[PDB]
Design a protein around this motif. Structure first.
Motif, PDB file in Angstrom:
ATOM      1  N   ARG A   1      32.871  30.605  42.543  1.00  0.00           N
ATOM      2  CA  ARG A   1      33.577  31.209  41.424  1.00  0.00           C
ATOM      3  C   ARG A   1      32.721  31.201  40.169  1.00  0.00           C
ATOM      4  NH1 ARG A   1      39.016  28.709  40.996  1.00  0.00           N
ATOM      5  NH2 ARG A   1      39.314  30.000  42.872  1.00  0.00           N
TER       6      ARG A   1
ATOM      7  N   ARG B   1      40.946  39.197  31.793  1.00  0.00           N
ATOM      8  CA  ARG B   1      40.931  39.927  33.054  1.00  0.00           C
ATOM      9  C   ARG B   1      42.274  40.633  33.320  1.00  0.00           C
ATOM     10  NH1 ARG B   1      40.926  35.816  37.353  1.00  0.00           N
ATOM     11  NH2 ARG B   1      39.205  35.047  36.015  1.00  0.00           N
TER      12      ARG B   1
ATOM     13  N   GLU C   1      48.718  35.404  36.736  1.00  0.00           N
ATOM     14  CA  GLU C   1      48.000  34.143  36.624  1.00  0.00           C
ATOM     15  C   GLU C   1      48.092  33.546  35.222  1.00  0.00           C
ATOM     16  OE1 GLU C   1      44.585  36.353  38.345  1.00  0.00           O
ATOM     17  OE2 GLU C   1      44.081  34.520  39.409  1.00  0.00           O
TER      18      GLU C   1
ATOM     19  N   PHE D   1      33.828  38.084  44.649  1.00  0.00           N
ATOM     20  CA  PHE D   1      34.351  36.761  44.963  1.00  0.00           C
ATOM     21  C   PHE D   1      35.155  36.766  46.265  1.00  0.00           C
ATOM     22  CE2 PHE D   1      37.609  33.493  44.565  1.00  0.00           C
ATOM     23  CZ  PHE D   1      36.808  32.396  44.482  1.00  0.00           C
TER      24      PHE D   1
ATOM     25  N   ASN E   1      35.967  40.627  41.112  1.00  0.00           N
ATOM     26  CA  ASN E   1      36.965  40.211  42.093  1.00  0.00           C
ATOM     27  C   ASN E   1      36.552  40.583  43.513  1.00  0.00           C
ATOM     28  OD1 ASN E   1      39.256  40.043  39.644  1.00  0.00           O
ATOM     29  ND2 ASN E   1      39.622  38.819  41.467  1.00  0.00           N
TER      30      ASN E   1
HETATM   31  C1  LIG Z   1      40.350  37.785  40.825  1.00  0.00           C
HETATM   32  O1  LIG Z   1      39.298  36.822  40.834  1.00  0.00           O
HETATM   33  C2  LIG Z   1      39.662  35.494  40.448  1.00  0.00           C
HETATM   34  C3  LIG Z   1      38.370  34.716  40.415  1.00  0.00           C
HETATM   35  O2  LIG Z   1      37.313  35.580  40.012  1.00  0.00           O
HETATM   36  C4  LIG Z   1      40.686  34.964  41.442  1.00  0.00           C
HETATM   37  O3  LIG Z   1      41.046  33.623  41.130  1.00  0.00           O
HETATM   38  C5  LIG Z   1      41.904  35.877  41.422  1.00  0.00           C
HETATM   39  O4  LIG Z   1      42.843  35.448  42.398  1.00  0.00           O
HETATM   40  C6  LIG Z   1      41.501  37.319  41.742  1.00  0.00           C
HETATM   41  N1  LIG Z   1      42.655  38.205  41.642  1.00  0.00           N
HETATM   42  C7  LIG Z   1      43.019  39.080  42.590  1.00  0.00           C
HETATM   43  C8  LIG Z   1      44.242  39.896  42.298  1.00  0.00           C
HETATM   44  O5  LIG Z   1      42.390  39.214  43.632  1.00  0.00           O
END
Ligand SMILES: *[C@@H]1O[C@H](CO)[C@@H](O)[C@H](O)[C@H]1NC(C)=O
Ligand SMILES: *[C@@H]1O[C@H](CO)[C@@H](O[C@@H]2O[C@H](CO)[C@@H](O[C@@H]3O[C@H](CO)[C@@H](O)[C@H](O)[C@H]3NC(C)=O)[C@H](O)[C@H]2NC(C)=O)[C@H](O)[C@H]1NC(C)=O
Ligand SMILES: *[C@@H]1O[C@H](CO)[C@@H](O)[C@H](O[C@@H]2O[C@H](CO)[C@@H](O)[C@H](O)[C@H]2NC(C)=O)[C@H]1NC(C)=O
Ligand SMILES: *[C@@H]1O[C@H](CO)[C@@H](O[C@@H]2O[C@H](CO)[C@@H](O)[C@H](O)[C@H]2NC(C)=O)[C@H](O)[C@H]1NC(C)=O
Ligand SMILES: *[C@@H]1O[C@H](CO)[C@@H](O[C@@H]2O[C@H](CO)[C@@H](O)[C@H](O)[C@H]2NC(C)=O)[C@H](O)[C@H]1NC(C)=O
Ligand SMILES: *[C@@H]1O[C@H](CO)[C@@H](O[C@@H]2O[C@H](CO)[C@@H](O)[C@H](O)[C@H]2NC(C)=O)[C@H](O)[C@H]1NC(C)=O
Ligand SMILES: *[C@@H]1O[C@H](CO)[C@@H](O)[C@H](O)[C@H]1NC(C)=O
Ligand SMILES: *[C@@H]1O[C@H](CO)[C@@H](O)[C@H](O)[C@H]1NC(C)=O
Ligand SMILES: *[C@@H]1O[C@H](CO)[C@@H](O)[C@H](O)[C@H]1NC(C)=O
Ligand SMILES: *[C@@H]1O[C@H](CO)[C@@H](O)[C@H](O)[C@H]1NC(C)=O
Ligand SMILES: [Mn+2]
Ligand SMILES: [Mn+2]
Lengths: 309, 563, 556
Positions: free
Chosen positions: C465, B68, B99, C73, C70
């Protein structure tokens, strides 16, 4: 006891009532006149007993440090001293034939060490020394304190040579991550084959420990080939540089030992030890300039006022 | 619950369970190259498959995350027009991989990337296992340099630097034996380094490619030529670190195999070894199936093919490398001449050695208290009469065919403590300097450290983006190295500080074990606060370096061989 | 493009095939144990080229899908996550607009509790596993309380069995596999029947074949029956994804044999290359990011990737994967689903209807193509006879027409079947069908997250998730770009180099095919619910065989 007005004892190291068992103790005999006794001097003797726990220290082996003449600041003879090593009595003998002394102001002092017999079984802290004259007993007091474990300290030990220096670094300061040490001294000559260190965690009731030779630690020599905790090591005849990187635990003390051989005609040694400690979250510097002394010492220019008939 | 066999009533049954482990857990052929036996048999396959299962469940989050964040990174770079100059390579890192690599990549690795001091100091930190001091008489100069260049660069001569014990060598010339994949290129660099008396700094001197026309570069060459020489060397050094660390995987495995075949499952040392070898038997199967397979991740990203990568640790092992005691920290560094004043002056700064010395100190304190707690005395009859331990040593030296292992019989606690310290140090320290998060944070940071070269090795002194990966390839390198990292180690309680804090080990080992564990937790707390607090001084240096290096942080690393 | 029969440069033409045969070799099977995969220098080069084209053609979809994931979620977490089973609509309402532009299936969400929707899926969104129970050659799978059978069906199991009205989906082979830690799975058998009262295909019973081995019916409690359907759909998703590996690997081996025997300027080779566009990417890419340890399958499915990879090789090791056995009518009447010999006719078989139309268009084109190429001239096409002999010999193709190939209908059959797989059969199981039909939550979870009950339900379904991650993977199996890239099935044969390089009869055939599939695609795009809420007789609108939506090639 007249004209003795007071007998004081302090540590030559601290100049106060706090002392290590290893310290030179300045034993001072104050002489004053403020009544109007005549003091039958010269010819006259004043006997003062020294408690058995105090001792004169002789260097060279053949010279008695208690035997001296004492003068005014202007050079006039006043008295001479001698110590009886069998009865432990110090005798002051004025040098003025059938001649009444009207005025007397001065301080006679000697530097004494505590006897082994006393220090083996001594305990902290307060100890009083009893000096007996004929009409009075003087009992100055000193606190026998344990080693200062809150900052780097320096310790002297006379040996056949001979000074062994100890630099103690307490882990209870930091946080300690790096240790920088440098020593300069004149006139000794450092033995570079005899630099060593130990790390102990026990400590007795006086804050001390005795590392075991290859609980208390183990003596570890320091050579060019040695690795960490030694970061760097230079040893010249008059200087030593040393550095350490490592984890000194909160309950541990790092002790660095370096020997200095002396000529036989040396009685006193100037020595400084700079210690820089690096501690997480800064840099704290310390200076340890305590000299080394081989014998009991005095000052013959002892009297400020003196007059006879 | 864990006890010694010495005074065990059920000793005959204990013996029976060991004998049945020895029928089902067998020494099999070496996989992932030709080094060390890999366990086979019904029980060895069950253990191998359990570890692969655990690894599968532990890799999912980091893999998905890395893909990602790679996709996001590439969208950003592409949107900004791609790479027009070497500075746009910072777009690969700024603001990304938050992350996958929460600690970010090395502070100062991008700002100061052209620094020669940073290029030389990497050999004492990021990859400290290759550098070696040149002995004044027992080693000869590897290659020559025009003495006018040497004089203007060092103020002295190669002869005098050699005689003074101030010359150091990195020799990647063995990679001359390998052929790059088509469209890929690579050198076989030898790097010459020296300790400069004028500045008291470890510095680069020359780089010889050992391929093609075989040029020798210097910091006095044209800017782009010298920079490209350092890039080629970093390519060879990356190949080296990644493929030599296979041995950091396979020497522990073989020591643990010999132990599993001889120590009871209820032996306290067996429990600590199992803890340190958590998931370890996954690395050879997983690596063989997705990393070093035809067209796997190695082939996709690196210059040399997977066949050459796999050949390298077997060649090392065949030349006698990979000895166990040979690898103890100070024994290794002293054999390479890097500790103290060794026929030459003392290195003023060796950040790997200093961080290693601290961490190994904490581990050794723990192991000393653990051995004393198990055997009950002071610095040894209980050890001699532990027939399981003595069998482990005989088994290691014999059937398991472990190199340079302490000979049997083992008479001194200090020997057992050395073994256990060195194993914990490999899994929670040495591994993570070469692999784990180190390639993404230090060893494989673009543009200075490319997995592959994309333009032929120059034949003259003239020159650039053409040797370096393009945007997609660069994102793919950072994405693979990010996949070697494990951002979740912290929340999983699988950090080096928790190494000995397993509830079953605390419940079954005895009070002394738990006291050594608490002291170890506090010690590694000190060490990790020291490392995480690192930053630059007034000269722009951290541990004498133009970048902040944190690869041995026990709060960040896992306690086991996780990739 | 030219037959070898009358090629002036026939000598060089042969020599190129000698060179290819020396550099493009059969290698060990990857992505399971089924079919050889190409090694050698030329095979490595074709593999790498397809993998690179595939990555280039995947960039858009994966990036889009990541950002839409994203978004989904963030919105679901801000709306408080899943409290009710109806809260799974948050997963799809107003999301995935570019990665799944057509949306997910109409009615799949609103009618998700419908037994007709659940049973009719076996005749559309995955029609490859249902099988009629022969009255005397097949036995009943398990017992169902006769009381329940009479209340449900107004008749008896034995009467339905004798009258050819019992159908079965058997997933109990999956009891061989052990789920990943923290995930659970059944080994379901579904019993369905053709209800004579209402003339509808309906569910009768589901048996988990794990644990206490319970049997659910639509008379059980609402959540028990519903969870039974959920477990069945979970098994069925495993099957569809892992069994469709053979849709990749059998076309591959046919094309490997063809590539080792046909000239590159042979017209059949130009058509085969067009249909197998990028095909050699699927096994390496799937090996590196789908079924690698800790990859997207591990991250999402209840069974680990090792068991997943084991499944097609198990199917194959028992005689599955036969080329001719896969012919649409041969397969459907082997399973008793069509043909009046088998029993009462299914009133609605959506997959057979759309497949029969689409295969009709493909076959008409292939018959015109063979006629344009050949006109006797078949038996003198020694490259063709080499292809047939090679496919049956070294390539080890299973149930391929025997050499010598004599009738044009046999070649028409081969090319029709290959085109049918890359343009149709693949996309019923793979491509966008999982995200639009096969794997729509909450009814079609990739994993179960609670133990299989032992007595007669968000605890089983993924959380927020994990649900978003499932729709993300399945959305990355889609290719929203196929229309703009002119790579749909309608464009299958309209490649410029083919149109130009073949002949006028070819281009005539192609225009015919474009007309036919235009009709087909408008037909399927106009579908909706009638007066009784049905499309093709099902409570949802199934569109997986739309030629204007599917790619023409085995794209992911
Ligand atoms: C993107 O999504 C993941 C879970 O799908 C999440 O943990 C992460 O924080 C998200 N990143 C952003 C930049 O929003
Ligand atoms: C579990 O396995 C252990 C390793 O095989 C066994 O250890 C062996 O035990 C024997 C008996 O205690 C020892 O015998 C020695 O040699 C002769 C035997 O012929 C005796 O007279 C000796 O007195 C005895 N002890 C000595 C010489 O000190 C074996 O030497 C010993 N082997 C090893 C490798 O240590 C255990 O016995 C066994 N336990 C049980 C309960 O079966
Ligand atoms: C693929 O990504 C491109 C940008 O990278 C984006 O523009 C595409 O959207 C489509 O682009 C077409 C131009 O080639 C355009 O005609 C079409 O309308 C447009 N569709 C949408 C929904 O934006 C992305 N998707 C594709 C090509 O399907
Ligand atoms: C993937 O890994 C990350 C990092 O460990 C997880 O994020 C952590 O989740 C725990 C669980 O409560 C939190 O306590 C931490 O604060 C989180 N850390 C960070 C940096 O966000 C994440 O939950 C994992 N995802 C899955 C699906 O397991
Ligand atoms: C290595 O890089 C670091 C960080 O990029 C440099 O530190 C910065 O230096 C500038 C100017 O000297 C200061 O204004 C910044 O405040 C510094 N940043 C930090 C975080 O301290 C450092 O100077 C570089 N070192 C060398 C040798 O070039
Ligand atoms: C191209 O290949 C064919 C096949 O080997 C060559 O020869 C003919 O092959 C047929 C089989 O279909 C035999 O029956 C004939 O005897 C072969 N022809 C002969 C021997 O003249 C064909 O000759 C090759 N083309 C060229 C130009 O050599
Ligand atoms: C290996 O695992 C299988 C399945 O868990 C088990 O049946 C067998 O007993 C195991 N063998 C061992 C542990 O030696
Ligand atoms: C994006 O992610 C996919 C997997 O979802 C991966 O195959 C691809 O390489 C990634 N893109 C980049 C630029 O790394
Ligand atoms: C395979 O690819 C390489 C690199 O482009 C090329 O040099 C080689 O000729 C190719 N091999 C074949 C058989 O086409
Ligand atoms: C299926 O759903 C659609 C749209 O929600 C609805 O119009 C139709 O009535 C439903 N069909 C059945 C049989 O419930
Ligand atoms: Mn590793
Ligand atoms: Mn597919």
């Amino acid at each position: 006891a007249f004209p003795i007005s007071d007998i004081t004892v302090v540590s030559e190291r601290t100049d106060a009532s706090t002392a290590y068992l290893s310290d030179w103790f300045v034993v001072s005999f104050v002489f004053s006149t403020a009544g109007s006794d005549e003091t039958i001097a010269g010819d006259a003797t004043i006997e003062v007993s020294i408690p058995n726990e105090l001792e004169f220290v002789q260097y060279p082996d053949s010279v008695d440090p208690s035997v001296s003449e004492f003068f005014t600041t202007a050079g006039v003879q006043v008295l001479s001293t001698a110590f009886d090593y069998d009865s432990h009595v110090l005798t002051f003998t004025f040098s003025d034939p059938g001649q009444v002394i009207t005025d007397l102001e001065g301080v006679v002092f000697f530097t004494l060490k505590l006897s082994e017999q006393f220090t083996e079984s001594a305990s902290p802290g307060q100890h009083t020394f009893d000096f007996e004259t004929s009409d009075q007993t003087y009992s100055p007091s000193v606190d026998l304190v344990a080693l200062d474990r809150s900052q780097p300290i320096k310790l002297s030990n006379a040996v056949t040579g001979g000074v062994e220096w100890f630099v103690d670094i307490p882990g209870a300061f930091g946080d300690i991550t790096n240790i920088d040490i440098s020593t300069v001294q004149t006139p000794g000559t450092f033995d570079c084959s005899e630099v060593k260190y130990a790390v102990g965690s026990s400590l007795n009731e006086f804050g001390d420990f005795t590392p075991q030779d290859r609980s208390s630690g183990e003596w570890i020599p320091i050579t060019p080939a040695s690795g960490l905790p030694v970061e760097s090591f230079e040893c010249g005849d008059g200087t030593i540089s040393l550095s350490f990187a490592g984890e000194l635990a909160d309950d541990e003390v790092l002790r660095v030992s370096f020997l200095s051989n002396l000529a036989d005609d040396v009685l006193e040694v100037q020595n400084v030890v700079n210690v820089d400690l690096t501690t997480a979250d800064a840099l704290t510097s310390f200076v340890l300039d305590e000299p080394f002394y081989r014998a009991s010492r005095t000052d013959t220019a002892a009297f400020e006022a003196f007059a006879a008939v | 619950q864990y006890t010694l066999p010495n005074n065990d009533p059920n000793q005959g049954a204990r013996n029976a369970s060991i004998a049945r482990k020895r029928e089902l857990f067998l020494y099999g052929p070496s996989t992932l190259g030709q080094t060390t036996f890999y366990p086979t048999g019904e029980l060895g396959n069950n253990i191998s498959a359990r570890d692969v299962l655990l690894w599968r469940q532990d890799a999912a989050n980091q893999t998905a995350t890395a893909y990602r964040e790679a996709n996001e990174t590439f969208a950003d770079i592409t949107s900004r027009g791609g790479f027009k100059t070497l500075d746009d390579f910072a777009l690969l890192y700024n603001g990304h991989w938050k992350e996958s690599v929460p600690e970010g990549i090395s502070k100062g690795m991008l700002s100061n990337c052209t620094s020669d001091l940073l290029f030389s100091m990497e050999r004492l930190s990021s990859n400290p296992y290759v550098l070696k001091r040149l002995h004044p008489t027992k080693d000869k100069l590897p290659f020559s340099v025009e003495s006018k260049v040497v004089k203007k660069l060092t103020a002295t001569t190669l002869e005098a630097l050699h005689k003074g014990g101030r010359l150091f060598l990195v020799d990647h010339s063995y990679q001359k034996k390998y052929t790059p994949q088509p469209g890929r290129y690579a050198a076989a660099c030898q790097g010459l380094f020296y300790l400069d008396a004028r500045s008291n700094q470890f510095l680069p001197l020359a780089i010889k490619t050992n391929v093609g026309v075989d040029l020798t570069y210097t910091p006095l060459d044209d800017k782009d030529d010298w920079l490209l020489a350092k890039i080629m060397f970093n390519n060879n050094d990356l190949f080296y670190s990644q493929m030599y660390h296979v041995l950091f995987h396979t020497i522990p495995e073989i020591v643990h195999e010999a132990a599993f075949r001889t120590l009871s499952d209820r032996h306290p040392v067996m429990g600590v070894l199992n803890r340190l070898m958590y998931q370890a038997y996954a690395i050879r199967p997983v690596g063989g199936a997705v990393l070093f397979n035809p067209g796997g991740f190695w082939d996709q990203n690196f210059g040399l093919p997977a066949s050459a990568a796999i050949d390298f640790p077997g060649s090392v092992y065949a030349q006698g490398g990979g000895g166990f005691q040979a690898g103890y920290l100070e024994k290794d560094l002293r054999s390479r001449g890097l500790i103290g004043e060794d026929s030459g002056p003392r290195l003023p700064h060796f950040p790997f050695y200093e961080d290693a010395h601290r961490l190994i100190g904490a581990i050794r304190r723990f192991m000393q208290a653990f051995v004393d707690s198990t055997y009950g005395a002071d610095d040894d009859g209980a050890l001699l009469r532990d027939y399981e331990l003595q069998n482990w040593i005989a088994e290691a030296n014999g059937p398991a065919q472990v190199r340079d292992f302490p000979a049997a019989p083992l008479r001194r606690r200090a020997q057992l403590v050395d073994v256990l310290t060195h194993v914990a140090w490999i899994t929670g320290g040495a591994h993570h300097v070469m692999n784990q998060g180190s390639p993404v944070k230090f060893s494989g940071v673009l543009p200075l450290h490319p997995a592959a070269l994309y333009a032929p090795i120059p034949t003259a002194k003239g020159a650039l983006l053409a040797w370096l990966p393009n945007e997609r390839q660069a994102v793919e390198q950072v994405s693979l190295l990010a996949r070697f990292n494990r951002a979740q180690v912290g929340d999983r309680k699988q950090t080096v500080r928790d190494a000995f804090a397993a509830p079953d080990l605390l419940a079954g080992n005895g009070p002394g074990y738990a006291a050594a564990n608490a002291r170890f937790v506090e010690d590694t707390g000190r060490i990790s606060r020291e490392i995480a607090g690192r930053g630059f001084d007034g000269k722009g240096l951290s541990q004498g370096m133009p970048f902040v290096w944190t690869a041995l942080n026990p709060a960040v690393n896992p306690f086991f061989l996780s990739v």
